[PDB]
């Protein structure tokens, strides 16, 4: 019935967790806790749950140190059940110590998992997908192994079932493929989406469907170069466009109320929840991507590093949207950003990939809260089980 649960010291994780506790705590009468610092838990202090500190111990960061910390705040909470990140480390094994059952949670799409995974559990290699993933390559860093034993470790120790922010209808198929290489049961909990005024008035002025959302920079990178590169791509696209920038850089003098521009945190859900949004260009981060889909928008993937290429081809590969044609250089081009975004946004021949995101769209809505609920009662059963164990 208790659980609790410890996001990573990361705000791109921190989000799941709290919207997983807002959900589970609705259901079952789950007396929940959430245990994470201070400084990241009072950014979240709105909307059942139970909050908990932590204090680290002075003189990538201390986290790795916070271990007799958890282990005496276990002790006290003594939950059914932990649900950790991926980065503690110790949190299983602080869990098993109090011998409490650890279910690992991960934030990122089941694809992405499943190469990693793929290449762990079968140096055997092949990959039963391979219009992702080909062989006939050749590559190498340390920084990518620690991250590689972090990732096999957390989907080892997760007891019977691997909770994951993500749904069937994306990819079941590799859902499936992560469960039976892991030996452990994937339960889907879908997406985790939460929730001045002048990005408002300005879009319900505006035709159905007719505007897109531009937010690649998305708290990571983004150059004057490739601004000048987007912004030129924007404009030659002749669309009404809003767009987000983390921070010459164009003339927005010029082509204004065509589009409008964000210096910082834009209303992402509720731009992309209007019935006059119809685009979304992206950098293909997992959160975005759940958002994105949710709510019937296309995706006009522009990806660069980490996880992004990965999510992006896969929803290439689902049909909800297409990647632009990087140039002779690695690098997008304004026409081969414009290409994608009139072919997407607009072009009838695009409207496959429309109908296909509001097809999707609908269903995420259709099935909701069912998958939650059975990731509830699976949760019910690993506790039972532990307790016929004795
Ligand atoms: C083993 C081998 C042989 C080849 C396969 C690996 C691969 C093809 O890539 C190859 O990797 C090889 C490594 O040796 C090299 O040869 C070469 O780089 C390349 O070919 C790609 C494909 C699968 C891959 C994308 C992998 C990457 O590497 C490592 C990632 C990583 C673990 C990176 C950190 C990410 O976490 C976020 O980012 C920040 C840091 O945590 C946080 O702040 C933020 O919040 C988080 O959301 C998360 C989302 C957890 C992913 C999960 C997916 C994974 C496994």
């Known amino acids: 019935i208790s659980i609790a649960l410890l996001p990573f010291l990361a705000h791109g994780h921190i989000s799941p967790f709290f919207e997983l506790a807002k959900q589970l705590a609705k259901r079952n009468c789950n007396v929940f806790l959430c245990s994470t610092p201070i400084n990241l838990s009072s950014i979240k202090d709105k909307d059942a749950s139970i909050k908990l500190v932590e204090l680290h111990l002075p003189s990538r960061n201390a986290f790795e140190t916070a271990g007799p910390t958890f282990s005496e705040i276990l002790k006290t909470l003594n939950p059914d059940l932990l649900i950790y990140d991926f980065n503690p480390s110790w949190a299983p094994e602080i869990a098993s110590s109090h011998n409490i059952p650890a279910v690992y949670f991960l934030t990122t799409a089941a694809a992405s998992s499943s190469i990693g995974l793929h290449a762990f559990k079968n140096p055997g290699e092949k990959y039963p997908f391979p219009d992702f993933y080909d062989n006939s390559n050749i590559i190498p860093s340390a920084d990518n192994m620690k991250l590689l034993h972090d990732f096999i470790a957390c989907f080892e120790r997760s007891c019977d079932i691997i909770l994951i922010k993500s749904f069937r209808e994306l990819e079941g ?211 039972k089980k532990k307790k016929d164990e004795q």
């Open 173 to 383: 198929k590799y859902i499936d493929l992560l469960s039976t290489l892991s030996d452990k049961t994937l339960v889907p909990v879908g997406p985790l989406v939460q929730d001045t005024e002048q990005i408002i008035n300005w879009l319900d002025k505006r035709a159905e469907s007719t505007v897109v959302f531009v937010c690649f920079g998305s708290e990571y990178f983004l150059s004057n170069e490739e601004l000048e590169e987007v912004a030129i791509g924007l404009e030659i696209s002749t669309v009404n466009f809003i767009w987000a920038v983390r921070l010459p850089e164009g003339f927005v003098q010029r082509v204004g109320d065509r589009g409008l521009v964000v210096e910082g945190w834009a209303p992402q859900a509720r731009i992309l929840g209007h019935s006059s949004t119809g685009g979304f260009v992206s950098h293909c981060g997992w959160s975005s991507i759940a958002e994105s889909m949710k709510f019937g928008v296309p995706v006009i993937a522009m990806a660069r590093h980490l996880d992004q290429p990965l999510n992006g081809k896969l929803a290439a590969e689902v049909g909800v949207g297409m990647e632009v044609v990087r140039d002779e250089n690695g690098k997008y081009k304004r026409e081969g950003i414009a290409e994608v975004i009139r072919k997407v946004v607009v072009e009838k021949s695009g409207e496959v990939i429309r109908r296909k995101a509001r097809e999707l769209s609908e269903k995420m809505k259709e099935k909701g809260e069912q998958e939650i609920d059975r990731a509830v009662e699976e949760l019910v059963q690993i506790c």
